[PDB]
Design a protein around this ligand. Sequence first.
Ligand SMILES: *P(=O)(O)OCC(C)(C)[C@@H](O)C(=O)NCCC(=O)NCCNC(=O)CNC(=O)[C@@H](NC=O)C(C)C
Length: 1762
Amino acid sequence: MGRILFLTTFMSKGNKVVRYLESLHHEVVICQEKVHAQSANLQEIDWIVSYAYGYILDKEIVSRFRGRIINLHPSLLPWNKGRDPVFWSVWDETPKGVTIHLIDEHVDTGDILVQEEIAFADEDTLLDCYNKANQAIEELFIREWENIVHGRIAPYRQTAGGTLHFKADRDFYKNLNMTTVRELLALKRLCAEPKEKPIDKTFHQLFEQQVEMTPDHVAVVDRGQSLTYKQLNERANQLAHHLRGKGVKPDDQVAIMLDKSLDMIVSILAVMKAGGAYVPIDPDYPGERIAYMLADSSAAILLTNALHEEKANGACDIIDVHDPDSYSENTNNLPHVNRPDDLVYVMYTSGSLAKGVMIEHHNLVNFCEWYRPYFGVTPADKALVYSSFSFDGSALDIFTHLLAGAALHIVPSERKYDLDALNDYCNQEGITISYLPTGAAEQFMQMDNQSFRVVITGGDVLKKIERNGTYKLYNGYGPTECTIMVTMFEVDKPYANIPIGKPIDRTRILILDEALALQPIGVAGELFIVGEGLGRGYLNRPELTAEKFIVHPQTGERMYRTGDRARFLPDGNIEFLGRLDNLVKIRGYRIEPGEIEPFLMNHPLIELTTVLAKEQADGRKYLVGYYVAPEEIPHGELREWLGNDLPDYMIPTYFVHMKAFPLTANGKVDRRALPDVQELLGEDYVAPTDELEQQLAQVWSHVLGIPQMGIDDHFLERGGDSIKVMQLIHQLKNIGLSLRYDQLFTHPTIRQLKRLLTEQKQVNGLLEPLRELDEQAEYETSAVEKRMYIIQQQDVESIAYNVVYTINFPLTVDTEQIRVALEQLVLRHEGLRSTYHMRGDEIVKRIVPRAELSFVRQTGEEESVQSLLAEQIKPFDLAKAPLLRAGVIETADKKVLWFDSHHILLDGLSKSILARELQALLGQQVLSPVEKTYKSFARWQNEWFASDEYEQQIAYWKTLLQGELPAVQLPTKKRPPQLTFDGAIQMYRVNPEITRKLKATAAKHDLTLYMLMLTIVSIWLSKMNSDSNQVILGTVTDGRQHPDTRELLGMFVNTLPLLLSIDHEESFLHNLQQVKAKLLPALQNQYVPFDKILEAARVKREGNRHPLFDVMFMMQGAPETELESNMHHINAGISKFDLTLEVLERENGLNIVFEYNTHLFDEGMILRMVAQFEHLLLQAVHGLDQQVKRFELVTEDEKRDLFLRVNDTAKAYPNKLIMSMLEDWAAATPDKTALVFREQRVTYRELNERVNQLAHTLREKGVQPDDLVMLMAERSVEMMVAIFAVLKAGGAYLPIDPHSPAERIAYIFADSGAKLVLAQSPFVEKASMAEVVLDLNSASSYAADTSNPPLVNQPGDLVYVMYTGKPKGVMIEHGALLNVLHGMQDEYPLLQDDAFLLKTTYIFDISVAEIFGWVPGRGKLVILEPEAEKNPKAIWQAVVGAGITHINFVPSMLIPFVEYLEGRTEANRLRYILACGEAMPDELVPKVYEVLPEVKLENIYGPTEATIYASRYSLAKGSQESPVPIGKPLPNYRMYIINRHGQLQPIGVPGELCIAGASLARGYLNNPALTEEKFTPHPLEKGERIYRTGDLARYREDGNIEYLGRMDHQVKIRGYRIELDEIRSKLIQEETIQDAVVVARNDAYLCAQEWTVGQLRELLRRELPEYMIPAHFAAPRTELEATLAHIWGEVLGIERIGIRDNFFELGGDSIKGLQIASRLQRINWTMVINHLFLYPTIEQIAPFVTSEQVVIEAAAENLYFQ
Ligand SMILES: *P(=O)(O)OCC(C)(C)[C@@H](O)C(=O)NCCC(=O)NCCNC(=O)CNC(=O)[C@@H](NC=O)C(C)C
């Protein structure tokens, strides 16, 4: 032992490490603050252990305790030294690990003691990586601390190079903690600084270079006149000489007021050559505007003519461009005075006076030097100067193409607006490339153009892509402040939101938040531009330039504040989402009107769309949808068209039809000339006509929050939920009318609702208030409160039903104001002051006046917040208040408020109420005191349980949940024997777009979003349950039966079992309506407690699963407060059920949370399932009229992973047929041993020559290719001589067992119709009814010619016909046999020194692998004596004597061969024992490797219709494979597992195995019907055939297939499939291995050296589920067991309970355990309820618990009053 000073600052004081040190009987002194060398915290201490310790230790301390200071750093030092190490281990892509090192004078550079390499998953979030890393360094310390303190570990120095980081180095990569590793590394590439050459040129320099390259090329074309490059250059130099002499210096602002002409191009280049920048002034601008631009530009010279000279009013030195005295005689290039950082132009932006944007030379050059190579601009191109020279569009028109040698065509403003004339000019002049603004483009795309090859657009949101031309379409984005454009996208596909593209050269785009921090990919934010497009700024306006042109506080880079919202897509392109301020609020919903335009244009008749937001003086804002179409479209039609996938507040109130959209002169839609409309409520508004219709409309207005409802307005499509329907019903009770929850979906408008209720009379008393209970000592609990109490008492140390939520606050929030407000809520709500105790056998509640809240204040870092939180999640004692612990973890950037409650208090609605009231109290707002208490509701409901309605509702579940309920066997792992509540979480986010389509679809078809998701979940579960027609799942309801309990803090949620049906042969919409028809009756009987529902159903209690259902589907509405939207639910590693799906509406989308049992599902299994749910969800929302059968579960990524891991087996194999190999080999090695029968040896030559003779004798009998001759012979050399001779002649051999009954051979005589029969002498008389019968033992049936007969067979000719219920003839071709032989030879090679054993009967295909397995490789075939296959002695004698290396065994016959060999030590040459014919016992693998080491046991599978084999799995000496897979396909084999509808099944889901490839059979002989049934073409093979095996099989994660039995011989007990092999193995593992086999009989029931009677059930109970226990195969001892029998019997209701009786079998539940424990406490016995689940028998549990509470009698006995 020794004293240890534990130094931690951002970790806790009670960590696993400290407690482990205390467990070793150490004294751990913990200091969370600074320590000075003279601090008493440094005396008598032997070690110093640091762990997330802020502050650096003093120098004297490091030297004084040298070798005794130990730090726990969560990194693989030397990598990521310092702060935030785990995050930097990912972002900098460094090695991952953890290090226990020594402390030196520097930051984590000391010598290492131990180090471990941890691995992060790409799909793990950063927070997941933090927990994994911090746990690894803690467990490593627990593992090595003793080896350190005892000096058993030698410190080693660090490998040289690594990384160091500090505290503020992550303040930009925040907001990224929930982002996965792959998505983080992607955002890195998409937003990290790339490595390029700078710009050392100006435009005139580059233009003067191109002028020398294409001097005589036409440069500008105005009217019919033209100008070449040299002529343009010389005319500009003349004017620039005159300008520079007048007094133009760099950074001057010479203005130009000319119309589009040649003189404009000359003028522009003259200013730049002189040295200045040109300020374009439109000659048509107002006079005051012209003067402002001149005054602001500070221009002394004006380049105008005589038409626009008087528009200056003596404002500058006018230089007429038509006066010859304005041009010099110098046509030589001027001397250069400019720099790449000089102004080139100043264009003004009238964003409403204008602002002069200043652009420099290097900005334009970077754009021009990118434009030319991007679009391939050649000197052969033609572009038009379309845009006015007062906009940056003309810069792209003029400057980008002049640097490429192209020709500019000046567009007269007389045209330009006539897009028909522009298409003419473009066609008759061959214009190839140009830039058209968005509005003009979308109108030009309706023109027949053949000249353009590239058309670029940009300015407004581009939507239309359908064009009448062969030109490529490009979309661009960019503000004038950043040159012209910064991103470019090629419009290839149709897009809803056409991307603005990827950044251009020397330009980087960043999507940031309001704090200028990096947003994750997909999350929107402000577009920030960085690169060589950023100009100097605004002219004479430095304040605004500092506002938009900012330097980054963390990157030091100059950025432009675009003010636009955008998001990065995964591909790399940027998607424009709108302006950050142009968001309008319609019906209280902030929307972007531009999101509606793509849906309206998708209408078949609308070709142009623009949605505008207009306002009325009253305040209300309305959307107007302007559309261009051939004629008008009905208003309702447009409301229907948008209603298919848009909510109501985004459906415009008014629609305006237009012939053509007005365009501004800039090329954009006018958006101000668009006609106006008019306070009307629309055309679909029908006002109430009766008193009841107005009464209902006001109730509808109150619930849905919409004023002036319509008679034909749909409740669900205007915001109605389930709670809104129940509100409507309750508000109608106050009126006096009764509406059922189902009648709303059948009457979803006020019109129909009136017709239903107008015949009803107002009844009083329909809504009774809740009576407030008078003051009492104790209060009775509710049924759900009792149930939560019963659950917690099973394991009184469980956190499964603990409710943890965290909220991240800014550091400005007073931590005490939170505590104060939380302490107010403890007073306001009696639930926070309620304590639950037990009075006898009754659970009661007691309210306490005041309770003390636990508010722990801590300090932590980002990589410790979770582990600081995880230790605060401790069990609750339901007898102690406040039942809610809280606290605040303060980091350097946030304050994490946390609280932990119990589900007996905090349900879903209680969390929303608590967040609402905390946000009010934190806002210093008043809180009107509460009015009702949970004690009142409990009494109300406990009384309602004795009503008549309750008896009606309990009959619904008794008449429904009784019978053989559905069985959902999800593809899980092996179910643990007990119950596991260990779990994890995976999340799937549905984007806001699909979320709208899901909601709009549900509303359109009288459904809620919950009903729609429930069907998708039901279909998802059904398809995983082998396409079941019925499923069972669970859900949760609010449980607020009395309407006065919606503001109370308590547990109300009730659990409902949902029995649903899915018809795969019908549409999604059909199943959607039938799901509603099964949910609504359940919601009408929803208030029966779940424990009573189970009892009424008379359900089992199988310990491997949960009652009634195993999967739960929950849905919570959107957050009502902002404090609620910023809350985070914590799982803490608990899964209450096998799988839970919760759909949470967050941020206009859907966050679907997958809570799963970690013992039943892996991370990869869940990742496949969340991807399959998305696959079905997208398939369904886009396939409503489609049948559910046509939806596929497997994803394209799973289809391609299954191919690569399984069906990628193609390998080119030689086409030399097996006969030609015997010829080729015999000629090479003629006297080498080929056959060995008994003690005689045949050589290749002897075999070949003997085979040749019988071949010639066969040819003269009419043996032609694809002719069949039957064989009746036993194991001999003649059989081998026969078989090979059949093939040499050209035919195929048909094996016929010679000892077959005459009826069988007659059948195969008829079906084959074959005439020839090669038989042995004892069987010639059996072939009596043939034609040509030859005795193989008579030299008459042989000939003299030892010559090899000619080759007459082709790779597609039949080689044998194996017969298999009347047998059928499987026809096998040559190349089929050649492929399985080459594959087996490539896998299990038989070489020259190796051999085979002929032991399988030739009426079995496995024999063929022995008949021919030796020919490739030139081995030998030892022919086992006939009937010796049953004698393992004779078998063994052969392998030892002949050196047999390849042997085939049926698993049943390998058992007697593994025996006998037990003990024998004779040497062996065996190499492969290939097993096939039946399922391999899991116990045989070790038995084989024990008796015969060095052998390689291999399990092979293959039907006769796939030659011989098809799949193989190599068993290893590890002996750990319980499934015993049949394996993966062989070379050029492909296997598929399909469902009942022909779809590929995913991993784990069972289906029918199917085969495909080269070694497939040609078909059944004389049975084309069966050939068409079992050999079918399939889209998986692209029209090629597949063989239906008829065997059930499942895919494994490895890829190896598992044999599940024949589909027509499948055993199912109560729906669940039975694996009878797993039953026998669990029965054989005992000592008495009688090896009894289990089989199923029908009465359907399972039946199967010890007097085991019913005790074997107890053995098969702790390993197998009750549905896989074979049905057919009182002695209380002490006073304790005698007592236990009485309490059990009295509670369970059973008489004479004996020990060794299963408590749960006797009807036990977690409720009856609490009763049994309660009765036992009053007699001072102590039983733990969890022990009942571990020791379900009395003799088992009586010692393992049932301790006594010691009673004493003393203290003060005698008193003496002095
Ligand atoms: P015993 O186990 O032998 O007897 C059987 C019974 C019926 C007693 C027992 O098995 C039982 O009660 N089963 C049902 C338990 C159940 O349904 N628990 C679910 C409770 N609801 C939730 O966990 C989720 N509800 C919420 O409101 C959460 N919202 C989101 O998570 C809150 C935590 C906010």
